[PDB]
Write a protein that binds this ligand. Sequence first.
Ligand code: MG
Ligand code: MG
Ligand code: MG
Ligand code: MG
Ligand code: MG
Ligand code: MG
Ligand code: MG
Ligand code: MG
Ligand code: MG
Ligand code: MG
Ligand code: MG
Ligand code: MG
Ligand code: MG
Ligand code: MG
Ligand code: MG
Ligand code: MG
Ligand code: MG
Ligand code: MG
Ligand code: MG
Ligand code: MG
Ligand code: MG
Ligand code: MG
Ligand code: MG
Ligand code: MG
Ligand code: MG
Ligand code: MG
Ligand code: MG
Ligand code: MG
Ligand code: MG
Ligand code: MG
Ligand code: MG
Ligand code: MG
Ligand code: MG
Ligand code: MG
Ligand code: MG
Ligand code: MG
Ligand code: MG
Ligand code: MG
Ligand code: MG
Ligand code: MG
Ligand code: MG
Ligand code: MG
Ligand code: MG
Ligand code: MG
Ligand code: MG
Ligand code: MG
Ligand code: MG
Ligand code: MG
Ligand code: MG
Ligand code: MG
Ligand code: MG
Ligand code: MG
Ligand code: MG
Ligand code: MG
Ligand code: MG
Ligand code: MG
Ligand code: MG
Ligand code: MG
Ligand code: MG
Ligand code: MG
Lengths: 197, 147, 122, 54
Amino acid sequence: APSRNGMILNPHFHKDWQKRVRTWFNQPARKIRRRKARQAKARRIAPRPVSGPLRPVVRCPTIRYHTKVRAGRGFTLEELKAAGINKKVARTIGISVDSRRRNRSTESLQANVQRLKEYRTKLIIFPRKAAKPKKGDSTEEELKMATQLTGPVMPIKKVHKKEKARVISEDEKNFKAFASLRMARANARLFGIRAKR
Amino acid sequence: PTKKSKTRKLRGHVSHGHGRVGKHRKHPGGRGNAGGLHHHRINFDKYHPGYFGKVGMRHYHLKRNTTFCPTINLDKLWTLVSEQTRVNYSQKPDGPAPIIDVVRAGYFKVLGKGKLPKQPVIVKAKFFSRRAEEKIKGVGGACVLTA
Amino acid sequence: MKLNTFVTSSRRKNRKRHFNAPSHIRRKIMSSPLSKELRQKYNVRSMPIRKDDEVQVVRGHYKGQQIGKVVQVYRKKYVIYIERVQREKANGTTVHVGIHPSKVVITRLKLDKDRKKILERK
Amino acid sequence: SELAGHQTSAESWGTGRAVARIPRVRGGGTHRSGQGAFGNMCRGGRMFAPTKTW
RNA sequence: AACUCUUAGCGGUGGAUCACUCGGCUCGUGCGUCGAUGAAGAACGCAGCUAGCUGCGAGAACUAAUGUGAAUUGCAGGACAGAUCAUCGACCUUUCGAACGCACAUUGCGGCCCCGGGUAUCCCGGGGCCACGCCUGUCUGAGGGUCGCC
RNA sequence: GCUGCAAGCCUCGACGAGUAGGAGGGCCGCCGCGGUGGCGCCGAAGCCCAGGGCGCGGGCCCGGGUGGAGCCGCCGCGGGCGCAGAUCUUGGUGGUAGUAGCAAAUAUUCAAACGAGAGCUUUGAAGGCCGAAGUGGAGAAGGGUUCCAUGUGAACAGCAGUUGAACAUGGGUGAGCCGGUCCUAAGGGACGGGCCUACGCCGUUCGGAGGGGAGGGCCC
RNA sequence: GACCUGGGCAUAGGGGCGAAAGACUAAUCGAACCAUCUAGUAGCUGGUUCCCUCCGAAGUUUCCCUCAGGAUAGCUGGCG
RNA sequence: CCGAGGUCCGCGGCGACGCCGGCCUCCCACCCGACCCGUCUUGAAACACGGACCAAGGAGUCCAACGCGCGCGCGAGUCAGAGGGUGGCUCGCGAGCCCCUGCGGCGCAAUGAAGGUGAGGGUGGGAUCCCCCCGCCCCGGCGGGGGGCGCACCACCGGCCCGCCUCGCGACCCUCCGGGGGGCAGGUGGAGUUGGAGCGCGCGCGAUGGCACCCGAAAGAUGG
RNA sequence: CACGACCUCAGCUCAGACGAGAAGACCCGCUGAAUUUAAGCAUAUUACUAAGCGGAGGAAAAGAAACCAACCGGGAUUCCCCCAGUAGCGGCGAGCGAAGAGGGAAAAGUCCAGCGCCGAAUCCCCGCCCCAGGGCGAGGGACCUGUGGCGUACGGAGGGCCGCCUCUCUCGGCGCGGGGGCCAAAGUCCUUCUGAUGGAGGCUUAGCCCGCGGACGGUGUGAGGCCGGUGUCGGCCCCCGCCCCGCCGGGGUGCGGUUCCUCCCGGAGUCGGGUUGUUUGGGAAUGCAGCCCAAAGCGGGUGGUAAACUCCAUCUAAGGCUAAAUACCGGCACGAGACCGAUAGCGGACAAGUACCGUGAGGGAAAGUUGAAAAGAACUUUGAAGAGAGAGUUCAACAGGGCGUGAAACCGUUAAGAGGUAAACGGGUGGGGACCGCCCGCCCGGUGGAUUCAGCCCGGCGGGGCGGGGUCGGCCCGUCCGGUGGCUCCCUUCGCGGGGUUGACGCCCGGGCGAAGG
Ligand SMILES: [Mg+2]
Ligand SMILES: [Mg+2]
Ligand SMILES: [Mg+2]
Ligand SMILES: [Mg+2]
Ligand SMILES: [Mg+2]
Ligand SMILES: [Mg+2]
Ligand SMILES: [Mg+2]
Ligand SMILES: [Mg+2]
Ligand SMILES: [Mg+2]
Ligand SMILES: [Mg+2]
Ligand SMILES: [Mg+2]
Ligand SMILES: [Mg+2]
Ligand SMILES: [Mg+2]
Ligand SMILES: [Mg+2]
Ligand SMILES: [Mg+2]
Ligand SMILES: [Mg+2]
Ligand SMILES: [Mg+2]
Ligand SMILES: [Mg+2]
Ligand SMILES: [Mg+2]
Ligand SMILES: [Mg+2]
Ligand SMILES: [Mg+2]
Ligand SMILES: [Mg+2]
Ligand SMILES: [Mg+2]
Ligand SMILES: [Mg+2]
Ligand SMILES: [Mg+2]
Ligand SMILES: [Mg+2]
Ligand SMILES: [Mg+2]
Ligand SMILES: [Mg+2]
Ligand SMILES: [Mg+2]
Ligand SMILES: [Mg+2]
Ligand SMILES: [Mg+2]
Ligand SMILES: [Mg+2]
Ligand SMILES: [Mg+2]
Ligand SMILES: [Mg+2]
Ligand SMILES: [Mg+2]
Ligand SMILES: [Mg+2]
Ligand SMILES: [Mg+2]
Ligand SMILES: [Mg+2]
Ligand SMILES: [Mg+2]
Ligand SMILES: [Mg+2]
Ligand SMILES: [Mg+2]
Ligand SMILES: [Mg+2]
Ligand SMILES: [Mg+2]
Ligand SMILES: [Mg+2]
Ligand SMILES: [Mg+2]
Ligand SMILES: [Mg+2]
Ligand SMILES: [Mg+2]
Ligand SMILES: [Mg+2]
Ligand SMILES: [Mg+2]
Ligand SMILES: [Mg+2]
Ligand SMILES: [Mg+2]
Ligand SMILES: [Mg+2]
Ligand SMILES: [Mg+2]
Ligand SMILES: [Mg+2]
Ligand SMILES: [Mg+2]
Ligand SMILES: [Mg+2]
Ligand SMILES: [Mg+2]
Ligand SMILES: [Mg+2]
Ligand SMILES: [Mg+2]
Ligand SMILES: [Mg+2]
């Protein structure tokens, strides 16, 4: 079979693959189908945003996506408590909640509490009955100027803040970056063998 | 397409470009990588040395996000900032130095391959090689570490 | 130009539902235009032909100003038979020749309780 | 169709008969019995390299 | 002469080719609904003239209703000509079949109730029933199984 | 003067075998598509030709005949794109060939009738055979109208046919005491139980609270 | 007579049944038939469809449970 | 005109089909040549196989991935893929257009089993080009003689990076418990480096996995 | 030794329900091969496939963490992309092969048991009363061997304190799409041609006429205007629905905040361990199952290498429910096609799963076309009849019923020629035959007839340019200066959205410049 210099190929076609072949001929048809579902859903929730509830801002786990934020699953119960929002009333006003997530640092906590407060100001709540405007309900002036919000509810901004050009201190120029990492790696390996003393 | 196909010029020729003596049959030497050690050994040893056997330790649950460490050389270090920024601070070499945060650009380690222009620069990376730092220190500037 | 994607434009389908059309649909298919005096009197372009209509052949071998009367509307064969539009057979027997309704022109309508209702809607 | 030409339970008669060693339809009282069924050269058989939808 | 062969015309034999296409194949879309209230499938039967196909079920080539508005057509004949067709919400829907009284290479063999007739008796006909498993409940019971009362 | 489609044109020199195989060119051919340029009842496609031609060739044009409704060039695009072979597939047709053959169980003949038509039907006579372990008379299984009358003589009945188990049109199978039905024979197969992941299987008078009937009038 | 025979029954495929021949088990038996896996695999036979133009071989090397086959080098063509 | 290959400024009989022309093709005849194709084979006209005849059908395909060559776009980038947006009651148009804070793929860094560490020119040949000098000129160039910068590429010699080995081991400012450095040098291993070339699309071909150019087993298995 | 209660277990053609079978493309649970590849072959591969068995639904399954991760942490499930032909598995051979993260589609969460409070506060059956929604019965049961309310890992409950206050469900009545019928523009104008026009030409030179209709089909040929339709969310008519708002009516019952008190907080032959078989990329054992062992409660599971110790992280297993993204070769109803065009395409364009074959499981064809219209050949005549000759229909019988076109093989006949070396074939020619085929141009010299007759002039108009029209003028684009003046600026320094400095930044403005153009 091998004729001359070339790769050792490994085509995984030793099963009965012809019985399981999915052609993407309905791919443009499911785009029309999923689009009609969003439009049909949009009319069913006409005042409410079509994208769903407000999602929090979470940090991607691994080091490969260290500096990357992402729309999370739901707001932590601690983030709702620090924003004055009850657990079981957040779903009624379109706020995503999940109780599995925790806040390991205040940076992630304060980032979503500000996001919750920014949302509640931009939130126009309609009274349960138009003849009875209650306390938490918005005023009759803001109800007329309330349209459906298309796109993600409060998309996450990635502020590309730049460190200002400073003057390099002489103490900063004497910092051995290679020796600092090389000592940190060596001390992290001999840490356990040193604690035995 | 089939217009420029070779089979269109093989009409009329009996063996269809596969010989009369040795006909074109069903796998005359085995299917796939058969005989890689017995009768295709010369081909495997000549063009794929090292194909047979084991080498090195095994890592069962290898997660590529753990060993993720994209690198960048010093010759492409100033590509992370605008060209006007590199020129503006060239006329002001008396302490105002730009900061090139290599982590926010998508790299972790800085390697000292190319030459660096004679400008003080503050380089923020998670890792530095010995020569990358001394070229940054030699040209003026510090190598700030980040996590 | 057809803008309705639910209506077919196909040689295979338009012919199948034409030669297999039900009798009540073949009535609408076997329509014939009205004369310029009837089209001006009733303000109707064409009409589904009936048995006792006076028509006039316009195309074919039997065309002419002779105003005949429909004998029967052979809805199964997509053809009508007129009084004097006929032919002598070999044995001398006279047989009616089939004419398609699209080739005749209704010079006089067979008005009844239902014909005047449809003429009003048109 | 993927089943085009393969709706037959044809077995080759083999050698020993003047027939040409092609899968022939099982016996019966029809014209179809004893006819080539599978190959692309046979009438009513499967075309060479049937056009697949993928 | 004949016979044989070649060539062309013509005529046969044969069916190619071409043109045609109410068919297939493939893709996409919307729905996504069977059955003891008897399904799928099967058998038999049903038309004025009817074998098959198809449609129906002893109301049998269709009933009612609604829409439609003059036909169906091979030949008649006949329309209470609202013809015909479509829709299809009413009604109808033989036997076998999960098929259900027991069976079945049997239109075999039984049982119960009710009705009508001959006359409760029997006989005849008709109607409603009588499979298996299981659930809730009722009813009727069983066992010193555990007690109570004596 | 001519060209100059420069992917064109012109000049000069040498060279030319070829299986397997490779490459190039094709204004070779086929089907469909996007363009473009047309053709057609004053006759398209296809088919036929002792007609006129073109190209090294693949092939092509024209004329004539037939045919009766579609078709083609060019620039691109997409192929189920070209056959002499495969004991190829399907269909058709030859030579063999008016050939082999219509040769198992002794047999037919005369006359007449019907009829367009008779070795073959029918009638009579004659001479023969089966010779009651029939070439006879009735059933079972199986066949399913083959039974019967009449008509037909296309097809079939391997010659014929006025004949038929053919075809066409009608008709025909009548039961308390003939059989089925009733009984269990071998056996099959439920039930209880057990098994089985299950569809189910095992097992057959055993094995369950397996009796649905009483006499006596609420009792055994 | 260890006879012949009908019908009804029983035994079903790696099973049956066999006074035994590998016999018989629906013209099929040293493992029935039917459908499917299955277009099973075949280093083995057979065939592999238009033209012209140009170039043009090898049956030798090494390795191979190889010796009717491959890998490999050589020879070939094309692209430059 | 013995001269850059031919002209006649020579001519005859018949010309309307009787008596003219038609290569090839049709028939026939003669001379020369000439065994039946396909196939396997060292060798086929073979007493080798297949083929009585004719029509129609009939066999290198599609998918995946790879290699190299080529066309194309852009270029240290390249491709937008899933998806989303929308000429708004959606033909042609299940196209096309658009944006995705370009996720990611493949490139831009290799090397080691790994912990890890991680890349600074010379010589020779060299298309092309530059300069000078002497002649000639139709002022645009031509001819002759010299020098030089040297593309790509190749040969060689280096530098550097990672692995390994050997040698050199030292005093010293980064030690801050622990620890990190200490021109190290000389060799050697690497699919490296010393001024990127790739990515996407298309095309062709080759070797593959798939029914895989087509037809073909003796079987084996599952269910009946 | 009966009578009662209970337990356990029976009977019924008891009252009222349920199950069965079909189909099975997609889906769930099992079972399970071998062809095949490894050029043999045994593990492996084929394949956790085919076949076999069971069970569903319009989707199913899955699913709200005994998860991932090791980070600045993610956060149910499903699907897509990528991860990735990667980690890894493998006679480490052939081959096999996921997952976390990331990007997207869709997103919705929750109920018990237990724990302990509430007079079982609960349910069913029967008989009913009012308007599917509410009630009643000194009716019968279920149930304390545990119904209901509260409540479930996000903590929960009760009592204080603080604050705001009661709003769902289901019916009647006025306001905000779907389906089925019916209808809705314009040539049969003129001329010609044809068997038939739907062909050709014309219709002030707006093709004549319509056009939001020039899709498609039918009609005797290529029809926008003959017909059905097509286009117009155009009109009319009849059924029917969703959502929101408002009033009336039957059922609804408050919820939050507490660096305050008190109390409560969990799924056993299960985890785990051993072993066995199988499965997986899971490798000192991924999942599953059998057997054995057999738990704990600051416990248990996991942290991809077996083990002990230790620290950290994460989850809370052994109970239940749950839409939407996803699949769909079956079914129902549609649309489409660079597909096939009667040996093709499904086996089946037709009385096709039909005829027919086999005892049976099963096997399984062949077969489309007269013409526009049957106008399907009256009648005469020969024959017993098929079959003929006439006649007749048709544009056509070179369309006469398996009838459009009618090829090749093969055959009859006619015409022509030939034939003692089987026939054919290459090259050369001959004969014959059948059908065909066949002096002008430029210039000039005279000649004789006609020149809405020539140079030139005048008048009107049009056109032409780097081997070179010249002189004035704008305009467009590129480019460079003049910053001539403020908006983005440079992610540009300063005080806390305002101000100050500069980039070949764009627009504005004047000059340049380019064989850059009109
Ligand atoms: Mg090879
Ligand atoms: Mg060749
Ligand atoms: Mg060959
Ligand atoms: Mg080849
Ligand atoms: Mg060989
Ligand atoms: Mg191959
Ligand atoms: Mg109209
Ligand atoms: Mg033979
Ligand atoms: Mg086929
Ligand atoms: Mg000849
Ligand atoms: Mg002929
Ligand atoms: Mg029934
Ligand atoms: Mg040559
Ligand atoms: Mg094709
Ligand atoms: Mg000829
Ligand atoms: Mg082909
Ligand atoms: Mg052939
Ligand atoms: Mg009869
Ligand atoms: Mg006979
Ligand atoms: Mg008779
Ligand atoms: Mg008889
Ligand atoms: Mg008969
Ligand atoms: Mg017997
Ligand atoms: Mg067997
Ligand atoms: Mg023996
Ligand atoms: Mg094959
Ligand atoms: Mg050989
Ligand atoms: Mg000729
Ligand atoms: Mg051969
Ligand atoms: Mg030999
Ligand atoms: Mg010999
Ligand atoms: Mg032979
Ligand atoms: Mg052919
Ligand atoms: Mg290669
Ligand atoms: Mg990228
Ligand atoms: Mg990759
Ligand atoms: Mg150099
Ligand atoms: Mg085997
Ligand atoms: Mg079922
Ligand atoms: Mg093998
Ligand atoms: Mg092999
Ligand atoms: Mg084997
Ligand atoms: Mg299966
Ligand atoms: Mg269902
Ligand atoms: Mg769904
Ligand atoms: Mg579910
Ligand atoms: Mg596997
Ligand atoms: Mg993931
Ligand atoms: Mg939970
Ligand atoms: Mg039309
Ligand atoms: Mg396995
Ligand atoms: Mg570990
Ligand atoms: Mg569930
Ligand atoms: Mg067919
Ligand atoms: Mg079908
Ligand atoms: Mg004709
Ligand atoms: Mg004809
Ligand atoms: Mg014909
Ligand atoms: Mg002839
Ligand atoms: Mg002759």
